[PDB]
């Protein structure tokens, strides 16, 4: 009854299913063994129009759907967590929730490697000493030991500096915003002084 804590809290009814799936896969040390199974079943829904019929057609009975899903996965070289998950999603016709359980499982998994996806906007193409110093300041905007998956991008309307877009927060350490906050600082003191 003791389950390992998920790395981050998430939404309802399609993210808590993935949270529970991560919680029971971390108990069996079986995270990367079921993540590729999620991707494989996404490819299986891409392949056959008779396997995504079980997810979208509302006229197949739940007995027929559960008997296709159970009698197709006869241990299939696969994890038992995946087989006990898909016959559970087949008992409600909730097989369409797989394509968002995979998204929230990807979020939990790349939060499991403390990795952080972000994009960086600069004015110039970076040097490899300018790059390794950018990661010295970007790591202080993460409150853990998360070693990021920083990419690069160029837009020279910035007057030098960097803008780190963490996909949920922005850190605008560009000089073009500094010279605008400089002008907005000296335009309000001279109205009072």
């Amino acid at each position: 009854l003791k389950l390992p804590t998920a790395p981050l809290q998430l939404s309802g009814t399609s993210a808590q299913i993935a949270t529970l799936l991560w919680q029971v896969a971390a108990k069996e040390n079986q995270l990367d063994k079921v993540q590729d199974e999620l991707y494989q079943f996404i490819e299986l829904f891409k392949q056959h129009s008779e396997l995504r019929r079980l997810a979208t057609d509302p006229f197949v009975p739940t007995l027929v759907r559960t008997k296709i899903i159970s009698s197709v996965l006869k241990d299939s070289g696969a994890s038992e967590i995946t087989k006990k998950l898909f016959e559970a999603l087949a008992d409600e016709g909730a097989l369409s929730a797989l394509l968002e359980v995979t998204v929230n499982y990807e979020e939990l998994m790349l939060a499991h490697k403390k990795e952080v996806y972000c994009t960086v906007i600069t004015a110039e193409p970076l040097d490899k000493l300018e790059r390794v110093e950018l990661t010295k300041k970007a790591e202080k905007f993460v409150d853990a030991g998360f070693k990021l998956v920083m990419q690069e991008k160029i837009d020279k309307k910035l007057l030098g500096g960097f803008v780190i877009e963490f996909s949920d927060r922005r850190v605008d350490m560009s000089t073009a915003k500094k010279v605008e906050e400089f002008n907005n600082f000296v335009n309000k003191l001279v109205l009072s002084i």
């Binding site: 829904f45 995504r52 006990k84 016709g93």
Partner: peptide
Amino acid sequence: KALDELRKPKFSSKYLIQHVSQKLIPAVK
């Protein structure tokens, strides 16, 4: 284009997580 039909799930059984958790915790050995 074949996965556009599954880009948002719609189902009954508001307590779906209970029926998934009554199948997933016995998958643990």
